[PDB]
Amino acid sequence: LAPITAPDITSICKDASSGIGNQEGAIRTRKCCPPSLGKKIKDFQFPNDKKVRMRWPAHKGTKKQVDDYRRAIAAMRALPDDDPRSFVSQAKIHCAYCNGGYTQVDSGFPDIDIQIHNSWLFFPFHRWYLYFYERILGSLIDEPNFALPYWKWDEPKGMPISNIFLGDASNPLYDQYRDANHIEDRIVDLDYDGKDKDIPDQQQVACNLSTVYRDLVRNGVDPTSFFGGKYVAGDPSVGSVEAGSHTAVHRWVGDPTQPNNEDMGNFYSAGYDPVFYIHHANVDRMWKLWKELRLPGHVDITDPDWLNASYVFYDENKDLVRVYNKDCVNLDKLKYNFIENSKEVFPWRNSRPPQRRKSAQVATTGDVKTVEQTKFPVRLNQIFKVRVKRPAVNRTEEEKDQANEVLLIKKIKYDSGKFVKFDVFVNDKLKDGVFTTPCDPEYAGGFAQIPHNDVMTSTARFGLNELLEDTNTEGEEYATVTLVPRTGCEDLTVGEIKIELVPI
Ligand SMILES: [Cu+2]
Ligand SMILES: [Cu+2]
Ligand SMILES: [W+6]
């Protein structure tokens, strides 16, 4: 039993020095430590709120919902910086936990930093972060049933940044450090890679819906693939949402003219944009949706090493509270939820990529070497293709409902002072001139990483059960994998590639 355990963050904290590629010229401070007020850390107790806080889509809020949120942020902004509830203090929380503020001294490892990103800590940490943030906002405006908006980018009209965030500084929800090309009611790109795609809005919307389906169904096949990999004291694959739509939105909003793409483009500065929290409000919602799908494998983590991991936050009373992963899995107990559509289906539920026609494919993926014929590690300074032996062919619906076939891209090594991304295509073999889109069945997804240099070693998982059917290759002994670099890959290597059956 070695769960990650935040220390007394008011006693053990150091300036952020990780994940910031240009510190000598950074727009926000790296002094992200919380105010030390001599408080004793209290244990969490479940809230006694009379009713459930209902978070609302940011593009369809009532007059009261918008006005309160706006009034709450104005109040938080007006607080002294040193106040732990202040706008600046709340932003620094993200910086402290994401950019090397804390050590694992409480677990007996004072020389190792805690990183809550790129692991199974990703979802529960942000859930707790928002929990206290929301309760703090409500107390500032004397609204005990106050609820955050959420950026519903899984809904077409929810996809552009909501106009409540736009205008100028006289709007509390406004932030000057945003990509000026992306704040004019333009549609978010949930698989953004730094380059604006010149495609019709209709197509971008369709692909955004496919991205949600991908993150929650095609690649989010089990707790490891969805939440992220196991992370314990003394020491991690990234999850489908985290390296997918979540990372895209950060890079899409951040200002590319700033040294570290501040604010949303980097973890240390993200919290200075009010939309950061509202984006994460929807990421929090994805966890709930993922469970509501009631598909095999869509279950919560039961590992004691996860359940007993804990963080510390200031609450609405400036008290320090220790919270555990085990206590945030049930929203009803945290006295909040999300206003849903009350319809038969999610708009993205059937956004599985269309089936590929055999008449659109040639016979083979071409002349390409197998893994065993290849010498690893392989440099990704150019497109890379290899055939990977599958554990079996022509599995029945029974076997597919018992085990996912999973593509593992292991030992991804690269300089993580810059945003990195490459894309993964499997069994791409179209006839010349065949019509293509950014969300074709061949596309397995991507590996994207916001800067987190402690140089760094990652792992990515892609589900193939649907894909092999969608591309008519469930009977081929090998899967041809194509890795395609988009940015920050000029020095990236890939140590191992393989496909495994992973029981549900
Ligand atoms: Cu974060
Ligand atoms: Cu984030
Ligand atoms: W158009």
From TrEMBL:
Cu(2+) 2 binds at H246, H250, H280. Disulfide bonds join C13-C33, C32-C95, C207-C439. Keywords: Copper, Disulfide bond, Metal-binding, Oxidoreductase, Thioether bond. InterPro entries: Di-copper_centre_dom_sf, Polyphenol_oxidase, Polyphenol_oxidase_C, Polyphenol_oxidase_cen, Tyrosinase/Hemocyanin, Tyrosinase_Cu-bd. Its cofactor is Cu(2+). Cu cation B binds at H246, H250, H280. One of its GO terms (molecular function) is metal ion binding. PROSITE patterns: TYROSINASE_1 (PS00497), TYROSINASE_2 (PS00498). Cu cation A binds at H94, H117, H126. The keyword DNA repair does not apply. Residues 117-134, 273-284 form the Tyrosinase copper-binding domain. Cu(2+) 1 binds at H94, H117, H126, H246. The keyword Oxidoreductase applies. There is a cross-link at C98-H117 (2'-(S-cysteinyl)-histidine (Cys-His)). This is Aurone synthase. It comes from Coreopsis grandiflora. The lineage of its organism: Eukaryota, Viridiplantae, Streptophyta, Embryophyta, Tracheophyta.
